[PDB]
Amino acid sequence: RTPSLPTP
Amino acid sequence: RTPSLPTP
Amino acid sequence: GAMGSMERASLIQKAKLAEQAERYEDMAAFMKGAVEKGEELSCEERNLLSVAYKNVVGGQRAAWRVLSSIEQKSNGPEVREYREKVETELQGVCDTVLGLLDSHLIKEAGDAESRVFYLKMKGDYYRYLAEVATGDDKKRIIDSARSAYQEAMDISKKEMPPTNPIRLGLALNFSVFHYEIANSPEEAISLAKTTFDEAMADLHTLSEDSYKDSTLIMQLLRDNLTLWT
Amino acid sequence: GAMGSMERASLIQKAKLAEQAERYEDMAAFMKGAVEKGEELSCEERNLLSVAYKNVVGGQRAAWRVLSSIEQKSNGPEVREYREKVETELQGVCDTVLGLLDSHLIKEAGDAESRVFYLKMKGDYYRYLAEVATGDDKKRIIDSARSAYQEAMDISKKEMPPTNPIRLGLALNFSVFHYEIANSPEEAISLAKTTFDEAMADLHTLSEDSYKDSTLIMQLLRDNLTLWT
Numbered sequence: 001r002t003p004s005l006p007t008p
Numbered sequence: 009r010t011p012s013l014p015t016p
Numbered sequence: 017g018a019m020g021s022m023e024r025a026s027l028i029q030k031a032k033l034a035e036q037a038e039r040y041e042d043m044a045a046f047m048k049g050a051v052e053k054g055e056e057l058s059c060e061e062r063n064l065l066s067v068a069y070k071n072v073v074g075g076q077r078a079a080w081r082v083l084s085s086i087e088q089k090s091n092g093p094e095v096r097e098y099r100e101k102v103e104t105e106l107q108g109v110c111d112t113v114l115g116l117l118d119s120h121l122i123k124e125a126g127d128a129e130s131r132v133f134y135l136k137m138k139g140d141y142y143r144y145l146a147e148v149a150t151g152d153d154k155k156r157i158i159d160s161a162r163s164a165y166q167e168a169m170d171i172s173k174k175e176m177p178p179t180n181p182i183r184l185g186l187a188l189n190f191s192v193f194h195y196e197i198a199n200s201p202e203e204a205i206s207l208a209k210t211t212f213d214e215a216m217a218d219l220h221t222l223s224e225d226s227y228k229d230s231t232l233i234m235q236l237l238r239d240n241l242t243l244w245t
Numbered sequence: 246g247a248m249g250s251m252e253r254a255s256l257i258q259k260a261k262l263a264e265q266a267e268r269y270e271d272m273a274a275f276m277k278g279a280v281e282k283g284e285e286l287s288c289e290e291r292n293l294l295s296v297a298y299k300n301v302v303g304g305q306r307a308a309w310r311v312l313s314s315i316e317q318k319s320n321g322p323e324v325r326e327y328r329e330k331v332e333t334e335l336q337g338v339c340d341t342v343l344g345l346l347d348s349h350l351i352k353e354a355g356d357a358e359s360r361v362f363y364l365k366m367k368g369d370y371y372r373y374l375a376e377v378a379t380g381d382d383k384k385r386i387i388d389s390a391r392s393a394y395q396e397a398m399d400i401s402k403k404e405m406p407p408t409n410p411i412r413l414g415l416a417l418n419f420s421v422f423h424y425e426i427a428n429s430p431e432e433a434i435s436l437a438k439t440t441f442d443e444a445m446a447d448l449h450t451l452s453e454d455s456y457k458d459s460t461l462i463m464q465l466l467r468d469n470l471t472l473w474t
């Protein structure tokens with residue numbers, strides 16, 4: 001499953 | 009704070 | 017919401033505290049409370065909302081995949097029952113957020129920064145529903161995600177420079193949508209490439225801090241393109 | 246408990262699933278349900294109970310410390326309010342576990358393995374209450390932790406070899422109690438040293454797998470002794 005925008 | 013038994 | 021009796025400023029301060037304590041369920045409840053006060057959200061407050069719910073749904077999505085994977089590998093009812101439970105709770109969180117966006121966050125968002133940010137969220141949360149959806153209901157969910165993303169893309173293209181982090185994050189997630197949900201890997205790739213290229217041509221205009229922000233997301237685009245090609 | 250209508254075997258299977266999904270709140274609720282069926286717990290089931298609640302309270306303890314630390318460093322009411330909220334919820338979880346131990350886990354535990362395991366838990370959960378307690382209430386909480394630990398030590402000394410992982414974990418945590426709660430660093434050190442030494446003299450009797458288990462905990466003892474001396 002490809003990374004979407006992470007949550008920093 | 010010193011480590012107690014961890015939860016594996 | 018039990019948050020009705022608490023000050024907006026206090027809910028915001030408690031949301032910041034909850035972030036620090038890594039208490040994302042509380043953070044979400046606090047930011048829900050804040051939204052329900054009815055005032056528009058600042059930039060910083062929009063981010064608190066985003067971080068709170070992304071953490072909550074991320075945990076649920078991860079739990080869902082583990083269980084769904086066990087369910088498949090076992091081709092007794094407990095795995096399915098429990099996966100349905102997690103799924104229902106995930107859907108509840110998605111519906112909560114979408115409820116907030118629709119009542120009345122999006123319609124009160126006049127500025128491009130605010131509207132694209134919320135429309136992007138709308139796409140993301142329909143996308144999460146689409147991840148667990150089965151059959152024709154799925155088609156409509158998918159169309160709702162695409163329509164929300166598309167509207168946000170159209171605004172960001174008219175109103176924001178190509179290096180804008182929100183425009184870039186939007187394009188990143190919309191591309192993920194194309195790749196993982198819409199079965200359009202070529203659309204995914206084209207969008208990621210085009211977005212990356214136009215941002216790179218505009219990096220020369222940025223300060224050191226804006227450059228750092230933009231390039232961070234540009235790297236995430238390149239990583240996906242590498243994986244996809 | 247809403248778990249009354251679910252089979253014991255299903256609650257146990259769902260607890261295992263929840264562990265895999267890293268859903269420790271669910272895991273705790275499932276194991277609570279299982280305990281409330283009234284049957285004694287196996288070894289494996291005791292561990293599921295322990296892991297579920299240790300994860301839940303560990304998150305709360307960590308959140309508590311962050312907030313309490315912010316509270317101190319700021320010598321508005323929101324930090325105190327929210328720390329009290331987290332604290333109350335932690336106390337609720339501790340009281341739940343202690344309620345389970347007292348009704349009727351401990352009193353039905355005939356074997357040394359089961360009784361020491363539950364008495365150890367009792368000590369741990371009074372210790373967590375003591376961590377957040379203020380004044381004279383604290384003294385009684387502290388005495389309850391010590392009395393529970395002490396009874397477990399007396400049984401484990403009569404009934405278990407010095408390399409028994411439960412005896413070792415007990416001694417580890419009791420030592421932590423002495424160091425961090427009871428203001429007896431010398432008692433802490435003596436116990437850790439003595440426990441370590443007697444286990445080491447008995448390692449020769451163990452199989453390769455028992456040796457690996459014992460030495461793992463022996464290392465945790467040595468790490469504390471290094472920190473404390």
Ligand SMILES: *Cc1ccc(S(=O)(=O)N2C[C@H](O)Cc3ccccc32)cc1Br
Pocket residue numbers: 005006007008063066136181182183185186229230232233
């Ligand atoms: C969807 C989305 C895009 C951009 C941001 S952000 O506030 O610009 N931001 C800060 C930094 O520029 C990079 C970054 C990475 C991850 C999350 C947020 C940011 C927020 C959001 Br939501």
Ligand SMILES: *Cc1ccc(S(=O)(=O)N2C[C@H](O)Cc3ccccc32)cc1Br
Pocket residue numbers: 013014015016292295365410411412414415458459461462
């Ligand atoms: C308090 C306590 C002590 C020992 C165990 S255990 O089931 O023996 N165990 C397995 C292994 O021997 C080491 C270990 C490390 C961490 C947690 C459990 C274990 C359980 C418990 Br609770």
